[PDB]
């Protein structure tokens, strides 16, 4: 039994090994702790929106959506229908992005490394979609606490449809490379098994639950924007191992394509931010012709909107699991407290239990199957 | 509604068992993956010939900042300091005073481009479209100091990029 220190996302890992078997595993985190939550308390709500792009930086608009939902719940307003449809469409696009990243980097760490390129081509196309809508490839800051910042340009839906009608074959090629390969099976099958009771007790959420057979999904049980309206299936595993989570994530990509099709077809007309110029800023023409609109633009961009006092916990089914925010407002234009609940924290906490009696080379596979991004883990 | 991903039962008749044994012994799925990679070799690569070819962008793209001016030649900025009040990263520093003709104009306008997070809040807070975040993204630098822009640098940026900045604003302003 010897102690190894695998130092420098960036992760430090201290493990006690007896032979090849892992006897103890202890992750040391905080190498990416910037202090987002304390810095948020010095910014207004609009000023604090961009931090959530950086929190889980593979699924940006999902974090934006969770923050916006919390702020809207505290504001007692609701976004217009078209804003909700745009939010759900770009949330499913973001889910596709996150799942591609997770699966292909899992394979890369295992050693496959070809689907990484195959699917980062598609990831670049989706970044182009993000850029067209907001002017930024990844940190869009598009979804605001009153709706969305800007409307879609006149050719965006056509390009989204054109992209999304070929993506199924890309998933099929990924499956041809990975699903039935015996080396992939022997790397993933019966590795990192977690029971349903241990998954529930340890605070796991997302695929980590469904890989063990637990039937839970916040998009189905507690829908938030327009999720109840759209129909999709929730993939459920049977063994609680890495292979089942792989299969769940691929099927989630397919169901995300299904929801994207539905969202493309059922886009409604109308405005994109709540018609309340004390929360959402007025248009530039109104601001340059109306006195009330100019006053409201001035005050919203200098001071911000005051949020009624109260504390809320808002959660969404982000690609990596339940992403939540505990937001405490004192009645002013700056949040009093903003605690962020990231599923990566709980999953990395459970890594020690999940890597019991496995080889040193399986810790890599377990970390990959947890889908750990250390921006959300450390904050 | 829910689906099962791994709830399949292998058939135990002799033909299925022989198929599984032949797959184990002759490596059929391995050859099929080889075929997938081989087919993928014979299709056109997605690489572009940078710097002779460029990645597509949008009129909404955020890039190097600029200070615009009216057609007459007078700068648009009036030192209202809304861009400085809204900046999430506190990258803007502004100082103003009455000009020699009583005009409300800045005497200091600094952007620390190593603090900026390129969110575009500054250009959407400005009521006179003075500060914009223009199309340029190739402005990498050999020293830390050249990334601390002052008023002269931003005005030169505006006068340098005005044609394309105005064209992009014309293309996009009806969405704002």
């Amino acid at each position: 039994n010897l102690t190894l220190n695998f130092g420098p996302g960036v992760l430090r890992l201290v493990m006690e090994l007896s032979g090849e078997m892992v006897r103890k595993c202890d992750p040391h985190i905080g190498l990416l702790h910037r202090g987002t939550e304390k810095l948020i308390e010095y910014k207004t709500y609009l000023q604090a929106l961009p931090y959530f792009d950086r929190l889980d930086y593979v699924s940006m608009m999902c974090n934006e959506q969770a923050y916006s939902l919390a702020v809207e719940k505290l504001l007692n307003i609701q976004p217009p229908p078209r804003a909700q449809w745009i939010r759900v469409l770009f949330g499913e696009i973001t889910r596709l992005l996150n799942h591609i990243m997770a699966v292909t980097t899992h394979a890369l760490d295992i050693g496959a490394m070809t689907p990484f390129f195959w699917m980062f081509e598609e990831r670049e196309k989706m970044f182009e979609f993000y850029e067209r809508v907001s002017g930024a490839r990844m940190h869009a800051a598009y979804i605001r606490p009153g709706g969305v910042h800007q409307d879609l340009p006149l050719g965006l839906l056509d390009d989204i449809y054109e992209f999304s009608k070929n993506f199924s074959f890309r998933i099929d090629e990924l499956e041809e490379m990975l699903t039935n390969n015996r080396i992939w099976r022997n790397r993933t099958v019966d590795i990192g098994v977690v029971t349903a009771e241990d998954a529930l007790n340890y605070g796991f959420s997302g695929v980590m639950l469904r890989g063990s057979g637990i039937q839970w999904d916040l998009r189905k049980t507690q829908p938030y924007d327009v999720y109840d309206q759209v129909e999709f299936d929730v993939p459920i595993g049977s063994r609680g191992d890495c292979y089942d989570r792989y299969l769940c994530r691929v099927e989630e990509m397919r169901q995300s394509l299904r929801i994207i099709s539905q969202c493309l077809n059922k886009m409604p007309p109308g405005e994109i931010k709540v018609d309340d110029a004390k929360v959402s800023p007025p248009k530039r023409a109104e601001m340059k012709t109306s006195m009330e609109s100019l006053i409201h633009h001035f005050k919203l961009y200098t001071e911000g909107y005051q949020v009624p006092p109260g504390a809320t916990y808002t959660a969404i089914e982000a690609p990596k699991g339940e992403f939540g925010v505990y937001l405490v407002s004192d009645g002013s234009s700056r949040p009093y407290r903003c605690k962020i609940k990231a599923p990566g924290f709980a999953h990395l906490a459970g890594l020690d239990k999940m890597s019991k009696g496995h080889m040193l080379a399986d810790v890599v596979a377990i970390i990959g199957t947890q889908d750990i991004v250390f921006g959300e883990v450390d904050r | 509604t829910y689906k099962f991903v791994n709830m399949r039962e292998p058939s135990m008749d002799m033909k299925s068992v022989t198929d599984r044994a032949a797959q184990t012994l002759l490596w059929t799925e391995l050859v099929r993956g080889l075929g997938m990679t081989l087919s993928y070799l014979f299709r056109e690569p997605a690489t572009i010939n940078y710097p002779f070819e460029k990645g597509p962008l949008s009129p909404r793209f955020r890039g190097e900042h600029a200070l615009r001016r009216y057609p007459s030649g007078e700068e648009r900025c009036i030192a209202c300091k809304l861009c400085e009040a809204v900046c999430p990263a506190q990258a803007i520093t502004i100082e103003a005073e009455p000009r020699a003709d009583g005009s409300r104009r800045t005497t200091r306008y600094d952007i620390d481009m190593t603090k900026c997070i390129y969110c575009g809040f500054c250009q959407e807070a400005c009521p006179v479209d003075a500060i914009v975040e223009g199309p340029n993204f190739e402005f990498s630098t050999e020293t830390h100091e050249e990334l601390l822009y002052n008023k002269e640098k931003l005005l030169n940026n505006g006068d340098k990029w005005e044609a394309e900045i105005a064209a992009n604003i014309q293309a996009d302003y009806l969405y704002r």
């Binding site: 409307d151 879609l152 340009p153 006149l154 050719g155 965006l156 839906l157 449809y161 999304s164 009608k165 199924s168 074959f169 998933i171 099929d172 499956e175 041809e176 699903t179 039935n180 397919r254 169901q255 394509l257 299904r258 994207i260 099709s261 493309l264 077809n265 886009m267 007309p269 | 033909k15 022989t18 198929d19 099929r32």
Partner: peptide, 29 residues
Amino acid sequence: ASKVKQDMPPPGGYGPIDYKRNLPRRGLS
């Protein structure tokens, strides 16, 4: 004068999108 013009799906919607898993069996006993 002019009427509303924004990004909307075309009349009748878009064509169907394939999402089902498609891994054909090459075929040999």
